[PDB]
Amino acid sequence: HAPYYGIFKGIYESVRLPLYKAPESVLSHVADMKKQLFFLRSQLSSRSEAI
């Protein structure tokens, strides 16, 4: 019933963060996702070069 629950529920689902997780984990998780994106880009570039 908290005023911002509906909005943040939507944000958790968008970043694939489970609802049972502590709210303090949201920024760390998003940071890791960005890290993963960088890694995937690097892998794609390496593979494209190898091909």
Binding site: Q43, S46, R47, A50
Partner: protein, 51 residues
Amino acid sequence: LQNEQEKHQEMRALLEKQQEIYPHVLLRCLSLLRQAASELRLRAQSDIDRI
């Protein structure tokens, strides 16, 4: 779980290395066979058989 994730990343790195080396080795084999077919069988040996 953390250990298995680290193992996964290591294995992935090894797999990528092997996928990089394997096509080059195939190309070297193909190059040798091409030499045997074009320079030895169609040219050198064919001339010998005729004479």
